[PDB]
């Protein structure tokens, strides 16, 4: 195994790609970093349902044959909240807003755990919440908390 590395280390590098979506006859559509989209094939050890849209891949460079699925990258929302960096909160840091907790649970908490409970009354579920008052009163930590 040590001796083989003198010979095998004589190959080229493998490109990285990005599957947009697959099409007919064992082929996919893959873009590079700053290099245009290519309609390439797949190798025999790769399944089409295993090929997910919006996923990186390893690619060979000589014939642009598919090599291996690159783990993952990001959601377009995980990066978003990562940029925003909201102060994550909980009930254990609420200072004396206990009736307002009970008010927001009726609007938000109930039509998640028990949506049928409103069809027991035949009314539609609420959609919009307005929180008002002076700044510095717990709005952001409350909405983050719920």
């Amino acid at each position: 195994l040590l001796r083989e590395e003198l010979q095998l280390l004589q190959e080229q590098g493998s490109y990285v790609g990005e599957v947009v979506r697959a099409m007919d006859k064992k082929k996919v559509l893959v873009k590079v970093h700053p290099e245009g989209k290519f309609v390439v094939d797949v190798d025999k050890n790769i399944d089409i349902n295993d090929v997910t849209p919006n996923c990186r891949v390893a690619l060979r460079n000589d014939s642009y044959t598919l090599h291996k699925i690159l783990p993952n990258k990001v959601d377009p929302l995980v990066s978003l909240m990562m940029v925003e960096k909201v102060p994550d909160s909980t009930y254990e840091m609420i200072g004396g807003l206990d009736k307002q907790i009970k008010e927001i649970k009726e609007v938000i908490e109930l039509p998640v755990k028990h949506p049928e409970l409103f069809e027991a009354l035949g009314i539609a579920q609420p959609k919009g919440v307005l929180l008002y008052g002076p700044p510095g009163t717990g709005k952001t930590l409350l909405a983050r908390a719920v």
Partner: protein, 97 residues
Amino acid sequence: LDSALLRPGRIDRKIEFPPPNEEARLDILKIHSRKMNLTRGINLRKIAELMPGASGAEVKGVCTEAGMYALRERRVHVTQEDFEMAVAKVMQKDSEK
């Protein structure tokens, strides 16, 4: 705001958030006082009574700042007179414009 946003069928619930009273200025000092290295005997009730209801953000604005007093006199335990040394400064900024 908009009267079209004040259509009664539009908004489902509006919730008011008052500034805290003497009862609700105490517990934000209580939860906020968790991560500080204190000194036994503080009487947080008096400290909550020294603030006549600014908001829930001046609670952290005082009690985070009180560690700078114990640190600038090189303590390892935050004492009660740091807090009354802080309320008259942050509330001086309440007295600023």
